[PDB]
Design a protein around this ligand. Structure first.
Ligand SMILES: *[C@@H]1O[C@H](CO)[C@@H](O[C@@H]2O[C@H](CO)[C@@H](O[C@@H]3O[C@H](CO[C@H]4O[C@H](CO)[C@@H](O)[C@H](O)[C@@H]4O)[C@@H](O)[C@H](O[C@H]4O[C@H](CO)[C@@H](O)[C@H](O)[C@@H]4O)[C@@H]3O)[C@H](O)[C@H]2NC(C)=O)[C@H](O)[C@H]1NC(C)=O
Ligand SMILES: *[C@@H]1O[C@H](CO)[C@@H](O[C@@H]2O[C@H](CO)[C@@H](O[C@@H]3O[C@H](CO)[C@@H](O)[C@H](O)[C@@H]3O)[C@H](O)[C@H]2NC(C)=O)[C@H](O)[C@H]1NC(C)=O
Ligand SMILES: *[C@@H]1O[C@H](CO)[C@@H](O[C@@H]2O[C@H](CO)[C@@H](O)[C@H](O)[C@H]2NC(C)=O)[C@H](O)[C@H]1NC(C)=O
Ligand code: NAG
Lengths: 49, 146, 49, 77, 49
């Protein structure tokens, strides 16, 4: 991934489900705001513990 | 929203185990579906005018899964869940060598310890391969785009 | 931060717990956080000093 | 298929543990009325209404799993 | 009690809905060999059979 740099804080989220590993962030749309928008979906085969 | 697919070498023999009410070794130690999602199951055969697909060594499955704890003797049965994997696959090879093959592997004490143990059986082929596909649908996981 | 994900726990070459087996995920920010590269591969520990 | 090039000789550099320096309490709770890092609905966006939803969330005003990075030994350059 | 018959003539005692206690038995047993299977030696006199 290409992520730019700034000075505002960052919120990141990681989870998994049987369809894939879902990675959420704010920067991608809410650079000035903050939210969980799914910027990545890993096509995973097995769950992670 | 999406489709999820699994393909495998499923012969005509344990097709009777394909029932959702069936709870054989296929449906207990090898493969269990999600009843909450509508699905379809298809058994197919290689056409003789088709060399694009290949064949494995032979069919196989696990007829018994069990886990040893750190005391070597408290046995925890392992069952396949809805689109989940018991660790029996991690110790059973892609092709089981023979019927009744016993595989054992060490487990760390902080994970319960002991030895994961599995017993596997094999099924021979006919002149042509019979395989199986499972198709399962997804309504609102992501963009509705298939 | 750089993360690693798997499903197995084991002791190291010196007995410290934390060995992961089989295919596992590692993600890493690099280049002052510009790149966020992730990869689900087989790790091999080195055996030197 | 992948490349992901490769590495250097089988000789690793040293690592030390000194974690007493890393042991310090910086109190930072998490407010839910300020919505500090909570999952959004994946495809169901609304407007100007309050809505209940069952998902994965943490508690309120929690402590965390506090870690921190630092710089190594140096002298001069 | 009595002169015990031999290994091919093992004598059976069955027990159901009563109080077995290996604490009064193994303390009075000069245990010189102890092999077992499928019920842990801490659980030979802990669980309810
Ligand atoms: C470290 O210090 C820097 C200061 O440089 C902080 O950066 C500031 O952060 C605040 C908080 O978000 C910003 O304030 C916001 O300004 C918006 C206007 O921005 C305009 O100008 C910028 C710069 O030119 C443009 O890039 C941008 O597109 C806009 O044109 C307001 O609109 C914001 O209000 C809206 O958002 C908030 C939050 O969602 C809502 O609550 C409001 O109701 C409203 O909808 C907001 O006021 C400020 O602009 C930032 N400055 C700069 C230069 O970037 C860092 O945040 C700080 N970091 C830390 C960790 O403290
Ligand atoms: C830093 O990251 C970059 C980007 O991933 C690496 O550079 C380039 O990486 C790609 C993929 O690993 C390499 O391309 C591949 O080459 C093969 C031919 O062997 C081709 O068949 C593939 O389709 C793919 O294009 C590319 O060679 C590589 N460029 C280089 C090495 O100059 C870079 O290697 C990374 N730096 C590291 C690992 O130190
Ligand atoms: C969003 O919701 C607010 C909250 O109800 C709305 O504000 C109300 O607007 C009505 C209409 O003028 C007033 O009678 C209320 O007193 C307002 N309440 C508050 C708390 O402000 C607002 O109009 C809504 N906006 C949209 C676009 O739906
Ligand atoms: C996982 O790694 C272990 C190493 O102990 C190995 O025995 C096992 O076969 C591996 N399984 C898979 C599926 O790679």
């Amino acid at each position: 991934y290409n992520i730019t740099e700034d000075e505002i804080l960052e919120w990141f989220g990681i989870t998994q489900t049987a369809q894939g590993v879902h990675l959420f962030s704010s920067r991608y749309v809410d650079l000035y705001g903050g939210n969980m928008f799914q910027f990545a979906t890993l096509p995973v085969y097995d769950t992670i513990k | 929203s999406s489709l999820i697919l699994d393909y495998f070498s499923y012969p005509l023999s344990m097709k009777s185990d394909l029932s959702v009410s069936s709870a054989g070794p296929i449906s207990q130690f090898n493969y269990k579906q999600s009843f909450s999602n509508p699905t379809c199951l298809i058994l197919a055969t290689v056409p003789h005018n088709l060399t694009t697909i290949t064949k494995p060594l032979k069919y196989s499955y696990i007829n018994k899964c069990s886990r040893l704890l750190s005391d070597d003797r408290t046995e925890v049965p392992q069952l396949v869940n809805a689109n989940q994997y018991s660790p029996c696959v991690s110790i059973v090879p892609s092709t089981v060598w023979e019927d009744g093959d016993y595989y054992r592997k060490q487990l760390s004490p902080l994970e319960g310890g002991g030895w994961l143990v599995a017993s596997g059986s094999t099924v021979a082929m006919t002149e042509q391969l019979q395989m199986g596909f499972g198709i399962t649908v997804q309504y609102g996981t992501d963009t509705n785009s298939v | 931060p750089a993360f690693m994900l798997g499903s197995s726990v084991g002791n190291f070459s010196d007995g410290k717990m934390g060995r992961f087996f089989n295919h596992t995920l590692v993600l890493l920010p690099d280049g002052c956080g510009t790149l966020l590269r992730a990869f689900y591969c087989i790790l091999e520990p080195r055996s030197g000093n | 298929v992948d490349v992901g090039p490769d590495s250097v000789k089988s000789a690793c550099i040293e690592v030390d543990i000194q974690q007493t320096f890393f042991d310090k309490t910086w109190p930072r709770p998490i407010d839910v009325s300020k919505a500090d890092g909570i999952i959004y609905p994946q495809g169901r966006t609304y407007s100007n209404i309050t809505i209940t939803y069952q998902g994965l969330f943490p508690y309120q005003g929690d402590h965390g799993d506090m870690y921190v990075y630092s710089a190594g030994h140096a002298t001069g350059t | 009690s009595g002169t015990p018959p031999q290994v091919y003539n093992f004598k059976r005692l069955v027990f159901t809905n009563c109080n077995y206690n290996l604490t009064k038995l193994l303390s009075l047993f000069s245990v010189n060999d102890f092999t077992c299977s499928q019920i842990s030696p801490a659980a030979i006199a802990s669980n309810c059979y």
